[PDB]
Enzyme design. Structure first.
Site, PDB file in Angstrom:
ATOM      1  N   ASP A 112       0.688  -1.161   0.112  1.00 44.49           N
ATOM      2  CA  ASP A 112       0.045  -0.108  -0.033  1.00 44.49           C
ATOM      3  C   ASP A 112       0.975   1.329  -0.094  1.00 44.49           C
ATOM      4  OD1 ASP A 112      -0.261   1.405   3.129  1.00 44.49           O
ATOM      5  OD2 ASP A 112       0.547  -0.689   2.742  1.00 44.49           O
TER       6      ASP A 112
ATOM      7  N   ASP B 225       0.052   4.883   1.919  1.00 50.67           N
ATOM      8  CA  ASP B 225      -0.323   5.810   3.147  1.00 50.67           C
ATOM      9  C   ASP B 225       0.517   5.240   4.357  1.00 50.67           C
ATOM     10  OD1 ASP B 225      -1.485   8.212   1.816  1.00 50.67           O
ATOM     11  OD2 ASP B 225      -3.393   6.866   1.644  1.00 50.67           O
TER      12      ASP B 225
END
Ligand SMILES: O=S(=O)(O)CCN1CCN(CCS(=O)(=O)O)CC1
Ligand SMILES: [Mg+2]
Length: 291
Positions: free
Chosen positions: A43, A45
């Protein structure tokens, strides 16, 4: 042979590993396959970007827009209220993850809807990103650099905002050809102003759906049967559900907060847990042995 004891990066106090023997055997397999079999699924963030800096929390890609000059204080008030109400459901210990699905759809639809009303032009995204407080984890240049050097596929699968994420890595000089971004991308009107979001919503808990809806990508990479997955949420563990064939997969999880509450669960579900860790040195050390 792999020995974590002899890798200095693994002796950092942030490094928590339930089953070091199993981790050594997974890494052993990664090294055996080398570049030809490797791919990365990650991912963005709080995994590639920092969770905090100088005791001040760093922005998610969504927060980059929340906090910019194009968004008013009254909008930020409403974004904060949304977050306080909906984040409590996200972290709620009693509700099943499935029960949280509609709440996540609501939160993301409502917060994206507030941004749409604010009038965000595509042309301003560069300035907004340059002026923002976003930070990449320490060691990002070597991370992206070694991967692009060896042409290793990198799949960044983000519940954030794709246009923002892309501008972050572009300005950082690391948005190379090996990097594919799957996220919530903005839909622009005739004037290049945000009017909505494309495709099916990706949120923290439904990454399984998107993982399966990227057959094109993963079937092209049939031979890349060795995977390094990097996540910071429990939901990030589903990001490899679309992988054609798996010979070895290593799962590395950043535990950035709620540490006492989540540590046991993270240690059971990720092979390697990095507690309040703002660098990529552990993954970089594995790449150094592998590539
Ligand atoms: O040529 S092959 O691609 O078959 C494997 C060689 N490749 C090159 C660099 N080495 C030494 C780094 S380390 O072991 O000291 O970390 C790791 C593996
Ligand atoms: Mg994340």
């Amino acid at each position: 042979a792999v020995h974590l004891k002899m890798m200095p990066e693994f002796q950092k106090s942030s490094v928590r590993i339930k089953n070091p023997t199993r981790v050594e055997e997974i890494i052993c397999g990664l090294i055996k396959g080398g570049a030809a079999k490797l791919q990365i699924i990650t991912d963005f963030d709080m995994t590639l970007s920092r969770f905090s800096y100088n005791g001040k929390r760093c922005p998610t890609c969504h927060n980059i827009i929340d906090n910019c000059k194009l968004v008013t204080d009254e909008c930020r008030r409403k974004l904060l209220q949304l977050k306080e109400q909906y984040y409590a459901i996200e972290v709620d210990p009693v509700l099943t993850v499935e029960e949280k699905f509609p709440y996540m759809v609501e939160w993301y639809t409502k917060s994206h809807g507030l941004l749409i009303e604010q009038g965000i032009p595509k042309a301003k995204l560069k300035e907004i990103v340059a002026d923002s407080d976003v930070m990449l984890k320490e060691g990002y240049e070597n991370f992206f650099g070694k991967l692009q050097q060896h042409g290793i596929p990198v799949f960044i699968f983000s519940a954030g905002i794709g246009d923002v994420l892309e501008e972050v890595i572009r300005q950082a000089g690391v948005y190379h050809s090996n990097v594919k971004v799957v996220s919530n991308f903005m839909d622009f009107d005739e004037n290049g102003v945000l009017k909505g979001f494309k495709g099916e919503l990706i949120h923290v808990f439904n990454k399984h759906d998107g993982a399966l809806k990227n057959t094109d990508y993963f079937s092209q990479l049939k031979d890349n049967s060795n995977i390094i997955l990097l996540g910071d949420s429990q939901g990030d563990l589903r990001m490899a559900d679309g992988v054609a064939n798996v010979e070895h997969i290593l799962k590395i999880g950043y535990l950035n907060d709620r540490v006492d509450e989540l540590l046991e669960k993270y240690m059971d579900s990720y092979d390697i847990v990095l507690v309040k860790e703002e660098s990529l040195e552990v993954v970089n050390s594995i790449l150094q042995k592998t590539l």
